[PDB]
Design a protein around this nucleic acid. Sequence first.
RNA 1: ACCCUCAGAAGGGAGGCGAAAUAGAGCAUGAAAUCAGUUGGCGAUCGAGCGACAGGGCAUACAAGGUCCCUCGACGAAUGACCGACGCGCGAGCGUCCAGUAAGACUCACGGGAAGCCGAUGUUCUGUCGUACGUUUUGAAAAACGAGCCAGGGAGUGUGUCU
RNA 2: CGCUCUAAUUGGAUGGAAGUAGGGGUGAAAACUCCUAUGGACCGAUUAGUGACGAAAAUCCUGGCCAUAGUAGCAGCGAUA
RNA 3: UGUCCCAACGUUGGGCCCGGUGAACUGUACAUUCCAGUGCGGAGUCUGGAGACACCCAGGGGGAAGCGAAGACCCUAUGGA
Lengths: 142, 150, 142, 49
Amino acid sequence: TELQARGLTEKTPDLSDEDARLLTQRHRVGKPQFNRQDHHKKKRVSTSWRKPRGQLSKQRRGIKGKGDTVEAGFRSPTAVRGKHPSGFEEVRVHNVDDLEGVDGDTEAVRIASKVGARKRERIEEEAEDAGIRVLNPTYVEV
Amino acid sequence: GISYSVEADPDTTAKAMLRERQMSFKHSKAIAREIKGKTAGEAVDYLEAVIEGDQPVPFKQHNSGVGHKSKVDGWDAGRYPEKASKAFLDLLENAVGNADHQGFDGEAMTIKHVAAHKVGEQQGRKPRAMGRASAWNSPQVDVELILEEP
Amino acid sequence: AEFDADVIVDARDCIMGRVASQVAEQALDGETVAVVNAERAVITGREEQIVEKYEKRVDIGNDNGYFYPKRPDGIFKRTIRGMLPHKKQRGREAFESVRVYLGNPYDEDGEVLDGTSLDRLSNIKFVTLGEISETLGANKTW
Amino acid sequence: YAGLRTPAESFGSGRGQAHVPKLDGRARRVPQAVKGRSAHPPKTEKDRS
RNA sequence: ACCCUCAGAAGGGAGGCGAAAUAGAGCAUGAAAUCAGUUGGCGAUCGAGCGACAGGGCAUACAAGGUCCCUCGACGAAUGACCGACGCGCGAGCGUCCAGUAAGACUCACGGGAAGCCGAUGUUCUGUCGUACGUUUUGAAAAACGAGCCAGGGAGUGUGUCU
RNA sequence: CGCUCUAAUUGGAUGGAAGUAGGGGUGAAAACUCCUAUGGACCGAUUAGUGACGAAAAUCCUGGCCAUAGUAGCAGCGAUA
RNA sequence: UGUCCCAACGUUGGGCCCGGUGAACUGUACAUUCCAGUGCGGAGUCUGGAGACACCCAGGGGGAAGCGAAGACCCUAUGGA
Ligand SMILES: [Cl-]
Ligand SMILES: [Cl-]
Ligand SMILES: [Cl-]
Ligand SMILES: [Cl-]
Ligand SMILES: [Cl-]
Ligand SMILES: [Cl-]
Ligand SMILES: [Cl-]
Ligand SMILES: [Mg+2]
Ligand SMILES: [Mg+2]
Ligand SMILES: [Mg+2]
Ligand SMILES: [Mg+2]
Ligand SMILES: [Mg+2]
Ligand SMILES: [Mg+2]
Ligand SMILES: [Mg+2]
Ligand SMILES: [Mg+2]
Ligand SMILES: [Mg+2]
Ligand SMILES: [Mg+2]
Ligand SMILES: [Mg+2]
Ligand SMILES: [Mg+2]
Ligand SMILES: [Mg+2]
Ligand SMILES: [Mg+2]
Ligand SMILES: [Mg+2]
Ligand SMILES: [Mg+2]
Ligand code: NA
Ligand code: NA
Ligand code: NA
Ligand code: NA
Ligand code: NA
Ligand code: NA
Ligand code: NA
Ligand code: NA
Ligand code: NA
Ligand code: NA
Ligand code: NA
Ligand code: NA
Ligand code: NA
Ligand code: NA
Ligand code: NA
Ligand code: NA
């Protein structure tokens, strides 16, 4: 009578102490929006980042308050870069064969959006039986 | 054209619409704004007074250069848009009629929703001095009305 | 009429600026202050130059306006306003919780703030706000 | 010759208009103009072997 | 189609077809600028590159994020005391000892708590910084030049030769 | 990093592709990806190629649209009807 | 002899209010400003103060170095006629 997600939704990965520490750091420190300069002043200018090139650009000159400029110094820790907030490393999956070789303790699987309901059902049931969490599970009424 | 922008329960509701009316869209917003919440019958009496010139329609948004009116309460500018008002009377005559053919008491129903939409312009051209012409168009207005039982 | 002042200050024979500076500091700390006997407050210096300054302020102005107070009442209050960011929310709140009075409408006798009192026996070059207002043309309503 | 079959000319300064070749009050020929030539198009002469 | 409405082969209402009429005639999809109505936030005593970063209010169906708060305790870089004891200084105050101790960012563990609750999103308030962008220029917020807004279009290419 | 089309290798889709709208996650970033709605037929990935391949600007081009504004004009003429 | 001293009253058409019709110019953004200062030496927007409750009608045009026109003057170009 209520919606329930298929699979090991609550499953968590096991990480070394150092990894969980770095994952916690990334989540705590975060980063600036890094949206293009003045995107908010002109509708025809989108948010997508572009290096400010103006010779007089206040942002390019690094004036405080004009937003941070993309730099390698803002990179996330190597050990955690790319991990789902849960700590799992994602593995894009298109079918049942893609599930092969996947470590359910270390990796979680994300079913490509294009996969239809018929194939998702199969993928979701065998992923769970392999101890693999499905980040984007189907919600069935049980 | 438009489609009803608000949901309406068929069992306690009556609908009506005007299509591509060549009248002032600005006078239409003002009129709709003023009669919403009124009784169909009240609306009819109101618009007839407007047409008669005894009742002003508050012009709250499109009021540049508009002279003040003593009967306008809580505001100053107002006018007597007879054309748009006549088109609304047609709209209400239809709604109230639809309402009656369905068993309700048309006149006593509340105007739950009323709104005008500019659906286009009948384009025109006006010759000007210096061998040039400029636009001279006519607004086309759609308007929805939903009557509801008290 | 009726002002729950947490502090009632007596300006009689005190240096307007030194009192104002303290009343400002206190109002920004959340205190409700009332300055009493404003007409008897005092400012050091050569009466002639002092009066020229205030007279200049009265004459200054234009259509936009420069409303400068003539009564010892407002002179003192305007003096305090200059020590507060009166255009900011916090500043206006503090300023509005301060009121100056001609004489003392209270029962209690206000207190004398430290380092604001002027010894009449060792000072001859000073003036009374009341005297200033009389020179400015104020109506001696005290 | 795609886009070049026109005698369109620019009016130059004087009418608050950009210096763009026009014909019958319609811009033409230049690459930034709709119906204008392709600036650096594919070419038959190119050796694709 | 039929019926009601209407000056009415208009339009509207109801109804019928079809998987779909929000496929109903320039009718596949249906962006932005923008308009009507309406929801959330602000709002008729208050100040202007519209924001970035911090932090508060209020607002939030699910999904695709799941964290967050407080007691205590563990660890604890740089830095680093009060009080008290003694000894100096005209004085503000300083010296020795207590002590590199208590403290000390992050992180973790036990117990307890939150689900509009944490993140996030909308808006608004407070703090810090802040006179667009691009170009011309020694020097541009510029009373130097360009653009009303948005979408789409809009600028190192080919042959030959040489290096 | 992203775009077009070609090739090899290999996948997705009417049990709902592309696109669009709103929303969630990742990446310093170019940008990748998921969810919900809409949509109703096509769509990728890796590798090697390909090129009429990326826009905020040029009094840039074309189209659409807002304010301007219910404003100017619909008076002036020896023919005031 | 209203050109002037020195302006008045009146006439007709507008102007103003109402119905109907219904454009254009112009627009980087923000914008209730004023006095000073500063700044590429001629600022609604920077700085300090002052003033400032919102909206609307009519007016005469002080400012936006107002709008309109890639300066005709002047010089420069191994420009043109
Ligand atoms: Cl890198
Ligand atoms: Cl309109
Ligand atoms: Cl004044
Ligand atoms: Cl202030
Ligand atoms: Cl003395
Ligand atoms: Cl840490
Ligand atoms: Cl190049
Ligand atoms: Mg934008
Ligand atoms: Mg008027
Ligand atoms: Mg002609
Ligand atoms: Mg062409
Ligand atoms: Mg369509
Ligand atoms: Mg120069
Ligand atoms: Mg483009
Ligand atoms: Mg392959
Ligand atoms: Mg550019
Ligand atoms: Mg255009
Ligand atoms: Mg106007
Ligand atoms: Mg006559
Ligand atoms: Mg200021
Ligand atoms: Mg020139
Ligand atoms: Mg000459
Ligand atoms: Mg010559
Ligand atoms: Na208005
Ligand atoms: Na009124
Ligand atoms: Na009234
Ligand atoms: Na003094
Ligand atoms: Na004054
Ligand atoms: Na031709
Ligand atoms: Na060839
Ligand atoms: Na907030
Ligand atoms: Na330039
Ligand atoms: Na600039
Ligand atoms: Na300037
Ligand atoms: Na325009
Ligand atoms: Na190109
Ligand atoms: Na132009
Ligand atoms: Na005369
Ligand atoms: Na003016």
